[model samples]
Target chain A: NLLLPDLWLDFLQLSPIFQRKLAAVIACVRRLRTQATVYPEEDMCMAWARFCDPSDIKVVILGQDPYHGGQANGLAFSVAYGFPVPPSLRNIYAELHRSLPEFSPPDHGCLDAWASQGVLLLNTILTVQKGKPGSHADIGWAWFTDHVISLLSERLKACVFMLWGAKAGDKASLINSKKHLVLTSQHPSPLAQNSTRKSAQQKFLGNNHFVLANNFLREKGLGEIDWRL
Target chain B: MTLELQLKHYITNLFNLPKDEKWECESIEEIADDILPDQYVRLGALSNKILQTYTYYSDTLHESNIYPFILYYQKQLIAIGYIDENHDMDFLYLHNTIMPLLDQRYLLTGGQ
Candidate 1:
């Protein structure tokens, strides 16, 4: 079924707009056999498989889109099990090391362990064309993901939503802060090389997002996320 | 406080930078000359790329100032200054591995 995993059941209750929009992307994928995605059709919705059970979700780390390369394997900011670490993942690990000193950096960037620990690592645009960045941005993904975020905001009482960079930060207006801790920072990508551009490369490294989110989770009586992976 | 003063004050507070560290650049070349060799390599290429596409904006923006500042790590330069939306703000922007910095939040909020 092209539907999101039947774990939460809340998603099943969402607007038909989401299901309809998702169906359109599925149809588009079927019509063009050459438009291979970086990840498999089953893997693109991997977050759903992990976060299917609503109570298992404690934190949400939103990303812009899937990596537009062969490395993408159904997880946001994650590559296939044996792939080399991408630069952005290297930067993320550097920040983690700085945050949790004495915590050794991992050699690989596969973050499925974090997903299993109840941290929802989701990309706004779930699927991307194999070699082209943002190739699927104009598709109906945004409309569907919007429903996902809005639904989480409505149902979850105290989730920690980590919104990195501008695109992710834009979702803040849709989230109610009284119910969730929305952490904002610049995207961890290397695109902020411009001294003149208003990019997030500056604020990304020092952000103690994982530590801060864990602190929030502890206070809320929820389980802490294993951010080390 | 006026918007200009508030802008400078907020950025200075966020970055923990002294108000006297900014430099006025006559040209992008002048900015390049003082940058550290490694930083200059990265920023130099980026500056050239920016100049290639956006020299017009930098040159033609009304009352634009090419002010550059130095960010240091143990007395060596690491990053160069970013353009301040609040023209009166004297802080430079620093990228990764730096302890102190600010982002578009202050830039867009007029320093809140």
Candidate 2:
């Protein structure tokens, strides 16, 4: 079995068809491993490990794929502690600082704090070839993650979905906006935030999704997340 | 040096403004009502800048209503100061959309 937590393992096992699809994906990944070096290694590939219990998830921040470097820690937009925070994550921190008066950009990019507190930092495509972003797009990770998204949208009482960038925004239809709070903005990549694209920068830099998410959680009696670090 | 002074120095260097230019520094709260209209005041000056930078370029400096202080160079609205969580001051140039000071390529083009 994959290094999935027991709850997730059981949940996946409940669906025989999904189990077959997952098996196919695993086989594909195993094939890819022999052809080219894959990122995130084997142990850290399970981004779901941090938030193992389905009921514990309160927020979902989705990204396109893992970083094509040593920075990818399975979790979306996060790196292991001590790794340099990427430009996209820097813009994220800038937005948080702008949005929340109590928030200051932390030095490290480890989002394990948010994950432990029920923020699911998930990427649609979990793994990528080293130094080659989007190399695993056709590898069936999207199908599996899409199912995960559908499950959360239907199963959970409510969640705050922070969908950044156009690719992430594509998953908006899967979310029940009326039931859950959905926040959308341009990707926090410097190509968008620091570029001459005025509208993109305004949308991203001006987005206060962090504050809005906390407010939604508080109103839903889920309490607020400490978005620091 | 203090954060405010560091901010002023950074702006001066960034814009290549006159070294001896006079600057009037004041908190956003203290700025005159006429210069900063009520329609533009926001939770923070950085927030205001993000909102006003594109649509209100004619009055960029006043519309943004910078925090800590609104900078001036020989009475010309030039820049603003933003203090980050690290207490580091980021000097935002207010005169134009193109940030020549921050981009080395602009220097090759004989900027400022």
Candidate 3:
């Protein structure tokens, strides 16, 4: 059995439709693994296992999918401690450096520190075929992820949702901005960097989302996130 | 408003150009020959033919003026290239219709 948090498992078990959807996703992944090489390995597929208790989640940094390379360790935008950092993650570190002066860019791409502090580093599509991006997009992962987002919106008192890029921004409707904070911006990919030439607005570079998220959390009496590392 | 007019207005507001300044539309070949010769030769060799191109310019905003070369194919907007304040060339794809073609070309050519 997957090492899902007991609370999340209990909540997921409440809905039969969710159970069916999760089973279908697992079945699809099983078939995919049999046919082709899959990413994040079998045991590491549920990288989000560490975020067991929903109440502990204070922030959500949603990504589109896992890296098609040998970097994905189940968490969005993260890799194992020794892997090279991806371009988008590099840009994210750059922005974090600018936003919080104390934040220094780490040599590694692992983001487990943030996850340990209640940052749900999730991807809309949890898994993908090795060397092929978006290959498993149609395999019913979005439905399961949507339910997770809905659970956070309904259960949490106040949390920050960082929706980078248009694909992630598409989930804005699921979050209640009235009760929580929602920040959006262009993706940190180099491809998205120059596209902002049409508008003078700085899309992602100078965005102080880390600082703002911390400020919002502080104001809500939820304590601040130590965004270092 | 027409797409051209809308694009013109967008450019005007983007660069903060004078309200009364006139914009002249020309082919990428015509504008690139005078300003971006390298791009002119590069665009000439594209497998995906560029049906038409337009460049909007103004006299008063010359110092801060930007040449936004808008590309179209079969009457659908494809991409826009412009010179930024840093003088480096930048591109923005408006549609994904020809992205794979252009992406492959740029990727192979190292975006030269």
Per-model chain A TM: 0.88, 0.94, 0.94
lDDT of 2: 0.63
Against the native complex, each candidate's DockQ, computed on alpha carbons, is: 0.02, 0.02, 0.03
Model 1: docking quality category? incorrect
Task: State which docking tier applies to candidate 2.
Answer: incorrect
Q: Which stretches of candidate 3 lie over 4 Å from their true place?
A: A1-3, A197-202, B1-112
Clashing pairs in 3: none
TM-score ranking from best candidate downward? 3, 2, 1
Clashing residue pairs for model 1: none
Residue lDDT tens for model 2, B1-112: 2333555455446545454644422111112111223332234332223211100011122223222333332234434444333423344434322222322223222243
Tens digits of per-residue lDDT, candidate 2, A1-229, equal 5556778775544477877788788888888889888978877889645554777789999987777656678998887886656656767898899988889998788898899888998889888887555678788999989988888888889899998766788899999999999898776653344333333323677899988899999999996899887
Query: Which is superior by TM-score, 1 or 3?
Result: 3
Give the interface RMSD values of the models in order: 16.2, 18.1, 16.8
Q: Where is model 2 chain B poorest over a 10-residue stretch in terms of lDDT?
A: B51-60
lDDT at A55, model 2:
78
Calculate each model's fnat, 2 decimals.
0.00, 0.00, 0.00
